[PDB]
């Protein structure tokens, strides 16, 4: 089970909540029987997506420890999407800004309670080179980095069977991917399809909000005649029409690089 991010995150939480004491990565690795190299990374994701009054502490030469308050609710995969951190980041997805006071009211929480949550949001954003400005509240940074942050957030907060996007049919997106595998003669790994379907959903939703992909100085010499880019561009024309957006060359290169970065085999 431990290759599934959300499952591994929950098992780590179950371990460090089992006793009021410090846990070393060795100790955790022993129980997971894998994944020694990713435990601290998982811990740094998890700590941002906790209930309000749960606190993880990291201490050199001690390891990790979690401090809990109250009636203890069952730890489930739902914890991530239920956190204040997630729910705030979902509101920041869209262009329409709020004040903190508005945001608090829409989340059904008191303003005092949102101030710590904002600091957890800022901490997660920091890892993607992103920032939060407050007057008004808005995500700030390179558009592509924003998409990567949302990709990470959705992949780690949902089971690999779930489809979190509204107003967007999974079967449609998977049809595009099916057409791409046919056109290129490849078979995408099931994980790569998940990443790509999420990334496309995210791109579609940001484009619908008006945001613009801008690539680094490098790729403005990308070969837009390379054969695989030529078919990718053609399949995505169907998408523009169907979702009512316009894909720039920036978009098509991004999507092409995403596909080329994926895991797949050639078909015969």
Swiss-Prot record:
One of its GO terms (biological process) is regulation of DNA-templated transcription. Coiled coil: none annotated. Residues 164-268 form the PRD domain. Keywords: Activator, Capsule biogenesis/degradation, Plasmid, Repeat, Transcription, Transcription regulation, Virulence. Induction: Transcriptionally regulated by AtxA. Transcription is also positively controlled by carbonic acid and CO(2). AcpB and AcpA regulate cap gene expression and capsule synthesis. Belongs to the AtxA/AcpA family. This is Capsule synthesis positive regulator AcpB. It comes from Bacillus anthracis. The gene is acpB. The chain holds residues 1 to 269 of 482 of the full protein.
């Amino acid at each position: 089970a431990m290759e599934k991010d959300i499952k591994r995150q929950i098992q780590i939480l179950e371990i460090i909540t089992s006793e009021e004491k410090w846990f070393t990565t060795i100790e955790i690795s022993k129980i997971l029987r894998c994944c020694n190299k990713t435990i601290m990374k998982d811990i740094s994701f998890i700590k941002d997506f906790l209930p309000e009054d749960w606190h993880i502490k990291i201490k050199k030469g001690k390891g990790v420890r979690i401090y809990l308050p109250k009636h203890r609710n069952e730890i489930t995969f739902l914890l991530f999407r239920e956190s204040l951190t997630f729910r705030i980041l979902q509101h920041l997805f869209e262009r329409e800004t709020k004040t903190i006071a508005t945001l608090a009211e829409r989340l059904y929480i008191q303003v005092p309670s949102i101030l710590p949550a904002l600091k957890r949001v800022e901490n997660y954003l920091k890892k993607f080179g992103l920032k939060l400005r407050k007057k008004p509240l808005r995500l700030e940074g390179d558009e592509v980095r924003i998409m990567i942050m949302y990709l990470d957030l959705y992949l780690k907060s949902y089971n690999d069977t779930e489809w979190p996007f509204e107003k967007l049919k999974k079967e449609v997106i998977f049809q595009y991917l099916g057409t791409l595998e046919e056109s290129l003669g490849i078979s995408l790994h099931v994980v790569s399809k998940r990443h790509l379907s999420f990334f496309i959903a995210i791109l579609l939703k940001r484009k619908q909000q008006g945001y613009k992909v801008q690539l680094n100085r490098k790729f403005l010499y990308f070969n837009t005649e390379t054969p695989d880019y030529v078919k990718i561009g053609r399949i995505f024309e169907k998408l523009e029409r169907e979702f009512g957006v316009s894909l720039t060359v920036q978009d098509k290169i991004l999507l092409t690089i995403s596909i080329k970065s994926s895991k797949y085999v050639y078909k015969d």
